[PDB]
């Protein structure tokens, strides 16, 4: 996160850390959607062009964390993965179209003050909220500049109009994505950065006071570059795939 701030304790009870065993290091962010399911970006586990292809034995999930490097003794819960599901049409060959994956924890975790699931959006929620001008929130332990924080960072960013998004990159944008960030003429700044991938872009419903996960940190060219925007996976659009795997398994 660039130009963000330290999160308050229990600000994102659904934030998860993707952590590898050997070497022990931070893979990506993610989110708790239920007692047994974690949502992340597919490129966190699979990315051939870089020889990245993690299996369940390769990772561990750390939930209820605040401190990046600290083993938070009676606070965090570490889980082993049972199985990983990548979207079958994830397009790592071109534009990271459908950058999403579901992770199944070996055992359900218990909720606490620090651990709590985020809501998945419904059609009307998505409709009301995913509007240019509307601010969402991204959190992560990623890089501070295009070094690393000691604590989870947060930044609120406005949804940008589709055309503007398209005009900022050479990359082929799809309906499964949306871009967010400030425009060069707004004075405020901020963005996700490396280490933030898989993390959540959330909005607070003014209807029911609930937090909904609208996007997943996907891609962007650099961090907080002027005239550039971060790209996110449109969760609602992939909701049927989600619903699909859960019911299925």
């Amino acid at each position: 996160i660039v130009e963000g701030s330290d999160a308050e304790i229990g600000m994102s009870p659904w934030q998860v850390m993707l952590f590898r065993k050997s070497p022990q290091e931070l893979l990506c962010g993610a989110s708790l959607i239920s007692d047994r399911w974690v949502l992340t970006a597919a490129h966190c586990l699979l990315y051939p062009p870089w020889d990245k292809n993690f299996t369940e034995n390769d990772l561990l999930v750390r939930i209820g964390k605040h401190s990046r490097t600290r083993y938070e003794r009676n606070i965090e819960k570490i889980s082993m993965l049972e199985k990983i599901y990548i979207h079958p049409r994830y397009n790592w060959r071109e534009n990271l179209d459908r950058d999403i994956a579901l992770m199944k924890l070996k055992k359900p975790v218990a909720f606490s003050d620090y651990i709590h699931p985020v809501c998945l959006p419904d059609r009307e929620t998505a409709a009301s909220l995913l509007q240019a001008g509307y601010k969402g929130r991204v959190t992560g332990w990623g890089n501070l500049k295009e070094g690393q924080p000691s604590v989870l960072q947060v930044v609120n960013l406005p949804i940008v109009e589709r055309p503007v998004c398209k005009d900022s990159t050479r990359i082929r944008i799809t309906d499964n994505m949306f871009c967010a960030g400030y425009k060069p003429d707004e004075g405020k700044r901020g963005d996700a950065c490396e280490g933030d991938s898989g993390g959540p872009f959330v909005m607070k419903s003014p209807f029911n006071n609930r937090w909904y996960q609208m996007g997943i940190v996907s891609w962007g060219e650099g961090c907080d570059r002027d005239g550039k925007y971060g790209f996110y996976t449109h969760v609602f659009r992939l909701k049927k795939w989600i619903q699909k795997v859960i019911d299925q398994f």
């Binding site: 229990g10 001008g133 509307y134 601010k135 947060v154 609120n156 909005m203 607070k204 609930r210």
Partner: peptide
């Protein structure tokens, strides 16, 4: 279910330091 309701905030009727920012954009 009980999703999107944080124990240390919503459940206690406490607002985080910058959520007002989001809501005011809606």
């Amino acid at each position: 279910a009980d999703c999107g309701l944080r124990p240390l905030f919503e459940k206690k009727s406490l607002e985080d330091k910058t959520e007002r920012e989001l809501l005011e954009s809606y």
